[PDB]
Amino acid sequence: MASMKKKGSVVIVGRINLSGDTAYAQQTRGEEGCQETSQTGRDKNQVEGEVQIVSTATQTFLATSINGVLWTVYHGAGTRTIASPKGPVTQMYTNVDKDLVGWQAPQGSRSLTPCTCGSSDLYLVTRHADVIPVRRRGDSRGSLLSPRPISYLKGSSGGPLLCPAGHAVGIFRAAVSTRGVAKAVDFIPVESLETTM
Numbered sequence: 222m223a224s225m226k227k228k229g230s231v232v233i234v235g236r237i238n239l240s241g242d243t244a245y246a247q248q249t250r251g252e253e254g255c256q257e258t259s260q261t262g263r264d265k266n267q268v269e270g271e272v273q274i275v276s277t278a279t280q281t282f283l284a285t286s287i288n289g290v291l292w293t294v295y296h297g298a299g300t301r302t303i304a305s306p307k308g309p310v311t312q313m314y315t316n317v318d319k320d321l322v323g324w325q326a327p328q329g330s331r332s333l334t335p336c337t338c339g340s341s342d343l344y345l346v347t348r349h350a351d352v353i354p355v356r357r358r359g360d361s362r363g364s365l366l367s368p369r370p371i372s373y374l375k376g377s378s379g380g381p382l383l384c385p386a387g388h389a390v391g392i393f394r395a396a397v398s399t400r401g402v403a404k405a406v407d408f409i410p411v412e413s414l415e416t417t418m
């Protein structure tokens with residue numbers, strides 16, 4: 222009872238820069254500072270952009286701001302708080318049935334706009350800043366135009382699927398593979414987020 226530990230916070234450790242002509246990952250915090258920030262929950266680093274790279278003590282994945290909420294996957298974050306300049310911030314959305322969590326978007330982040338284009342020509346943004354064309358195949362599924370080993374998608378849950386106009390269509394949740402090759406992706410549609418809200 223007196224020995225019981227507390228899980229650390231999710232920590233923003235970088236971002237995917239989409240502001241220019243070139244997408245690229247930036248690290249903003251190294252592993253040591255990440256471990257310390259997870260324990261204190263106090264992160265005074267300035268936040269920028271739409272897609273954050275986040276980490277716990279044991280996992281790293283992505284988180285995406287849409288309409289003022291930083292969204293990610295329950296299988297990454299669980300029920301964890303996120304570190305912030307004035308301490309841990311409790312989730313404002315949690316839905317294990319959708320593999321979905323959300324916190325208020327950090328000060329300084331930019332939010333994607335929810336897509337209303339009805340387009341099926343999508344783009345998945347990974348933690349390595351690859352921008353992967355995906356054809357929408359259903360409410361929560363899309364096929365990769367160029368399949369590739371699942372290794373290339375590992376760590377990108379919580380990242381966005383975008384429409385041609387750069388709106389948010391969904392949050393990457395799981396990969397569908399055959400013999401280790403990702404042929405399709407499973408994602409949380411933005412309408413499911415907009416309803417949760």
Ligand SMILES: COc1ccc2nc(C)c(O[C@@H]3C[C@H]4C(=O)N[C@]5(C(=O)NS(=O)(=O)C6(C)CC6)C[C@H]5/C=C\CCCCC[C@H](NC(=O)O[C@@H](C)C(F)(F)F)C(=O)N4C3)nc2c1
Nearest residue numbers: 280281282296297317320374375376377378394395396407
């Ligand atoms: C605990 O409470 C819950 C509640 C609801 C959940 N709901 C789902 C869905 C789920 O799924 C799991 C996790 C997810 C996954 O792995 N996510 C990616 C990823 O990067 N995570 S991550 O960042 O590395 C990580 C782990 C650090 C956070 C995008 C993948 C990239 C590569 C894939 C690696 C191989 C695993 C394939 C598996 N495929 C799958 O399940 O396909 C479904 C749709 C099927 F089977 F029906 F086809 C799958 O993708 N996952 C299996 N866990 C749930 C758990």
Ligand SMILES: [Zn+2]
Nearest residue numbers: 336338384388
């Ligand atoms: Zn759109």
